[model samples]
Structures are given as structure tokens and as C-alpha cells.
Target: TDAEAARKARATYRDGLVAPTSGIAPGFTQANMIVLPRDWAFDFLLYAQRNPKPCPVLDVSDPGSPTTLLAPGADLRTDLPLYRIWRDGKLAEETADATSAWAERDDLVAFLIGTPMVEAGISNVPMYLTNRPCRPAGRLKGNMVVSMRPIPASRVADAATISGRPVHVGAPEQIGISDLSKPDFGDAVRIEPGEVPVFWACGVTPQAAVMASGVPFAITHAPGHMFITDIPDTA
Candidate 1:
């Protein structure tokens, strides 16, 4: 069931279904993607190394290849529900399929990063670009992007233990977040009375570099629309 679900979800995307990928393929791993030129590979890899919490590297695609080891039969250029094309640090376009935009680029390298699960009926976790700067890599330097989740007061400790660690707790302003409702990326989720806002390093951290460093060209998954991989989550 796990394998079939992942493959089927990817197939739907490949057929040009345009929608957020948050709740699809229930038990498999979903990934955030960033496609860059071969020249920027080492720099980004180093960036991820320096900021491991927010930019965990899952799997990388070979230069100019549309295939990834995470899902052998899936095509990166068309498997995701939506993609953002970046040019000179600006988002040029959002498309359901990237095959035409990719246009036989021989130097493109794709980075697949582990993503937090997106539950059905909820917007993506709110992300904030924090005041803290990550260790700089060549041609890559940016602040970390942290995602927030509201945990019930009694289970705050359990949530922290299950997920890695919170970069920030209840006070959003301490981390340069002037308002919890206005996130740098993704939609905000409401925090109820007994819930405490918890933050963690987000995979969107790499996009912060894409914006700050003025990368010449890039492709990435739209917020909350991830690449479904065949790998199962044991947890």
C-alpha cells in the first residue's frame, strides 16, 4: 500500500494535477526540492552542512538528470504538483510541469531535502526568517527559516522530543518575527487557547539563500507542494 500510494500520487502529478501535495501518499516521505546549476552545488552543500537543522539533505539528483534515487521511476521535472522558476533571485514563474522550463539544461543539479509532514485540512506551518545568520558557504549566505507549530500546553515536551528541537518557543518576536500571523513563507495556522507556538528549523532555509545570494537560475517546489518519494517513514 505504501509503495502503490506514493507511485499513484506521483502519477497524478505527472499527469498535470495542480494542487498542494501536503496530504498525499500518507505513509511515504515527502521532500522539498531545489534545482540549481552544477557550479553552485558545492556551495549549497556546504550551506546545508552549516545549517543542518533547517536544511537536511535527503537525496541529490545527478547533473542534468530528471530522475532521483528517492523514487526511481519518477521524473523530477514533472512529478511535483507545482514548481517555481527563479531567475536572478526572483521567482519568474510557477508551473505545474517544469519540463519545458528546464529546457535541456546540462548543468542543473537537484537537491531533495527532508520536509515536515503537512496534515490534511491545515495550511503549511508558518515560516519566519530569523535574525540569526547561518555559517556562510561560498556564494551562499542567509538567515535560517523556522517553521512554527502550535502544541497543546501539556504536550509541549512530547512534541519537542518527537521532532528534533525548537529554535524558538512562545515568543515569536524574540526571533525577529514581528507578527505570528504574517509569515515569511507559507500560510499561518491558528494557535488555540491551550496551545503553545513551537518553532523548528525549516527546509525552506535554502530558499532564503536563493533569495539573498541572487542565484542566477533555479527551480524549486512551491510552498507545501512536495515531491512524494517511495521511501517509507518508519516513525
Candidate 2:
């Protein structure tokens, strides 16, 4: 029964990413899951709670709990399609499952971070780690990871209206992007004939913080391998 539940959850998550019909179920909040060594969990959780605009904390797992209490009947070990490993603060490997790494960790905790665009019904947003940090919390510091979305110049205001935030538009360099044709995370979509690129604060801000923290080991979801939650898109 456990294996079947895990399989169904993984399949549902995969289909949601690849197919249009596999939409988020209503009345559930989707989250971006980030797992780090237990030693770093408290600080990172503090970092996320303090910076809700970027890292919205939905749930935190007790040390060694592979399953989060927030998303019951779901298994973190297999639900996500991909995972990224960071060794000594550098990306070391990408894998379909992190069970091996989990086995090796004597200290591990998961942080479920929420994304703004997921609720907005927008396609995946392009993200990049910046050279900025959100002041200093404990010993962690780094640039904020920013996400980019291209919106039609005419609809830019409308998109912003739905987002309830001022969107960075037009110039890419102004927002730390050198090329619109290239993206650090997620695929770059066409801007169309009359569109401008809009930028937002991404949950990946912690990735930059991790690099700045210079921790020896870390784990994260690969660029576009987002963990879809039960949350729905209203817009």
C-alpha cells in the first residue's frame, strides 16, 4: 500500500509538469521543498520565515523525517522528478531520487518553501542567484535569487495587477540579466512582438545564500524540477 501511494504521488506530480490536464487540486497549497543538513536547517528555516516575500515556509520536517506532516499521503523521497546535490556549496550531482544521500546524512531536514507564480497560474519563472544577501541571519549571507517572466507590454500592467507587486520590465541588464535569449533556470520563452520581461523574487534565494554560507553539503531541486503541491492556480 505504501509503495502504491508513493507511485501514485510520483506519477501525479510528473504528469502535472508535463500535461495540461494534470492540474493542481483545489484547496491545497503547493510548496517548493528544500532539504539541508540538520545543522543548517534552523538557520535556513529562520531565513525563510523572516523573508516571506521570497522563501515562504509552508512546513518544516523534524530531523530525519523523510515524510512531511503537511502533505500527508505524499512521500518526498520519490515524489519529485529530480534533485540537485551541492557539495562544499557547489552543485555536485543531479539524481532522480535522493535516498542514497538521505541514507548518508546523519543530520537532515526538509524545508517546504512556497512560490508566488505557482498561485498566479503563470508558467515556470526563470530564476538566477544574485550577488545580494538579505542582511545577515546567524552566519548565512548571499544574493537574492530572482525569477523572470516575460509579459506582453500591454498585459504587463494586468499581470502586475494580479501579482500585487511592481514588476521589473524592459531592460534585462537593469534586473541583472545580460541576455534575454539565455536563462540560468527554466526555459526562455518568446517575448512576442510587443512584450517586456518581468522579474520577481524567487524561492531559490536560498541557493545564493547557501553558496554564500559556504556550507560543505547541500541539496536542492534542479532548475525546473519544482515540487508541485496540492495548491491551485486561481488566475
Candidate 3:
């Protein structure tokens, strides 16, 4: 059933699926993506390295190649449900397939990073942006972003372990996140009675970083939306 789900998801995107890929293909990884000019690649890599918590590098593509070691034969431009192109700090376009855009450029590089939202099986969650600052690199600087989900106080350890990431903020109140209902991104999945909130770093950090850095051009997945890969989601 899981394998079939992965196939269906892949087919959905391949056939121009435009919906966000959340809660689908449960045990398979769905990643966050960023495509950049070769010149902008290193700086963003450094920015991610500096803020490793939010930017977990999954796979980086060879310049101009859409295929990756993780999912051989998969194309980044067309596999994701949707993509957004950024120009000079402004959104230029959003599309179902980016092959035509990346098709002409042989030096554009793709970065595939992990998304905290993929941990939904471990803990059905919602994410937020904190007033906290992420370490800066080049022209990038922004508040740390996080995913929040309700957890029984007793099982916080299990939530932390299963999520493949640490609890980014101990309590929502610990950071400037006052209203869990108002998230900077993603749907606010319901938090049940007697549940406490735990937050983890989100993949939007670099998107935030690039937007802050004012890069002349960039491409990224819209928040909550992602590139669902063929890779299995194993802990």
C-alpha cells in the first residue's frame, strides 16, 4: 500500500498535480527545493551550513542536471507539484513544470533539502516563524522558521526522536510565537485537548534567507508545498 501510494503521488505530480503534497505517501520523503545560479549556489550552501538546523541538505544536483543520486531518473523541474520563480526579491511566477525555465540553463544548480513537515507520521504538526534570528551568510538574514505539532507532554521524547530533528523550541511561549493559530506558513493542523506544542526547524528557512538576501533570481517551492521524491522516508 505504501509503495502504491508513492507511485500514485509521483503520477499525480507527473500528470500536472497542483495540490500541496502534504499527508500523502506517508512513509516516503517529500523534500524542499531551491534552484539557483552557480554564483549564488555557494553562498546559499554556506547559509544552509551555518543554519544547519533548518536547512538539512538532502541532495545537491550537478549543474544543469535535474536527476539526483537519491532518486535516479527523477527530474526536479517536473516532479514537484508546483514551483515559484523569484526575481530580484519578488515572485515572478508559479508553475506546474519548470523544465522550460531550467531547460535553457546548464549552470543552474538544484538543492534538495529535508522538510520538517515530512515528520507528520511521527507527529501530525503545524509550523511557524519565530522572532528568533538564523545565523547570516552573505546577504541573508531572517527569523528562524519552525514546524509545530501537538504532543502529549509525556511523549515529547518520542516526538523528538521520530521527527529526525530536535525540538527547535521547547515551548511556543519560549519563543515569540504567541498564537499557534496564526502560522507564517502551512495549515494549522488541529491541536487536541491536553496536547502541548513542540516546534522543529522548517525547510522555508532558505527561502526566507534568499528573500532576505535579495538574490536577483531564485526558484523555490511555495511553503507547505514540496517536491515529493521517490526516496523512502526512513528514520
Candidate 4:
């Protein structure tokens, strides 16, 4: 019953609907998508390999194919709520459906990157660029981008243990984040009185690579907009 909702959500998005996918189908896992030309595929693969913490890949589609094993009947080109078109490493367009763009190129490769967990409820998770550097691959090189979530003081250790030790805890300044209110991207979520903001290696790491490396063209899920997969979230 719960997983069916995720499928229904995909169907709705496939029909050209538009909205953020956060908090949908509570227990199902969600993924970040990036479609790059096949020529740049190996570079991205090697890049992800070098930065597993933030860029762990879940599934990859064969070049020119929009289908994924993560969801049986879903179409990558149109099943997500929104897609960002990147040209020459710059954001070119944002659309509810990417079918037209996908059809324009025959060498496109899709990457489904893993998320930490099914997000609960928020338009977007707060993200910041850290001063910490990432090891450079062939052409993909940039500092890490971290996503922050507020957790109660009592659950801080539990969150860290469950999600793997966060890259940083409450001290934002130490990581180059001056003010939580002003993030490089996404909305600022409030931290309750007894809560601590925990930062994790964000899935948007590739997007940062896309910008840094100046790849010719690419398609990615807008931050906070993600793809819903049929797989359940499990330990």
C-alpha cells in the first residue's frame, strides 16, 4: 500500500505534473539524477568512485535509454517532478518534462545517485559549499557541498550513528558556512531550541562537479527535486 503511492506519484509526474518529491511515499527510497553525454560518462564514474561519501551511485542507465532498473515502468526523461538542463556547465532551463531534451541527444547517460534516506518534509534541504577540498578526477574537481538537517540534541548521536558520522556538527563556521540563514542553495530550516544542525555529504556533489568541470551539456534534478524509486528504504 505504501509503495504503491510512490508509483502513483511517478505516474503523476510522467503525465507532466510538477512539484518537489520530498516526503512522498515515506518509506520508499529516493534518488538524485544526472544525465550526461556518454563521452563524459567515464569521467563522472571515476569522479564518483573517488568521492563515494557524497556521490554514491545506485543505478546507471545504458546510453540512449531512459529506463532504470530501480523502477520497472518509470521513464527517466519524464518521471521526475522537474529537471534542470545544463549547457556548457551553466543552468540553461528548468522543465517539468525532459522528453524533448532527452530526444535531442542520442548519447545521453543517466546516473541515479543514492540519497541518505527518504526525506521527511521540506521544500528543500539546506546545502552549503565547504572549504574542504575533493580529490580531483580526470576533469571533475571541486569542494564538497553538504546538506544539513536539524535534529534534537538527544537524537544528535543517534542521527550521526544511523547516517554515518556527519562531516560536520553544529559549528557551521568551522566548515566555511558563515550563516545558516544564508545558504548557497535551498531554504533555511529552523533549528529548535535543543536541536543541533548536522551536515552530511550531499548528493548534489555531481552538480557541483558539472559546474566546476564545465562539461558541454548535462541534465540533472533540481536540488530538492528528486526521483522516487520503487525500492524500499532499508538498512
Q: Best candidate, lDDT-wise?
A: 4
lDDT by residue for model 1 (39-64), tens? 99989888888888888888988888
- As for TM-score, the candidate ahead, 3 or 4, is 4
The C-alpha stretches of model 1 lying farther than 4 A from their native spots are: 115-122
List lDDT for all candidates, in order.
0.83, 0.66, 0.76, 0.84
Report the alpha-carbon TM-score of model 2 versus the true structure: 0.76
Cα lDDT for residue 169, candidate 4:
92
Report model 3's TM-score to 2 decimal places: 0.84
Clashing pairs in 3: 126-148, 127-147
Candidate 2 vs candidate 3: the lDDT winner is 3
Q: For candidate 3, write residues 28-128 as lDDT tens digits.
A: 77788998888888887988899888888888898878877766667787778888988888999998888877865679888999635334433225667
| Residue runs of model 4 more than 4 Å from their true location after superposition | 1-3, 115-122
Better of 2 and 3 by TM-score: 3
Which residue pairs in candidate 2 have backbone atoms (N, alpha carbon, C) closer than 3 angstroms, thus clashing?
28-231, 88-216, 132-142, 132-143, 133-142
Off by over 4 Å in 2: 1-29, 115-125, 129-132, 165-167, 182-187, 233-235
Q: List the pairs of residues colliding in candidate 4.
A: none
Residue 95's lDDT within candidate 3 is 87
Over 61-143, each residue of candidate 2 has an lDDT whose tens digit, in order, gives 78888777655666676667678888887889887777778777876888877535445555466665444457556667666
Runs of candidate 3 with Cα error greater than 4 angstroms are 1-8, 115-125, 186-189
Winner on lDDT (1 vs 2): 1
User: What lDDT does candidate 1 reach at residue 213?
Assistant: 89
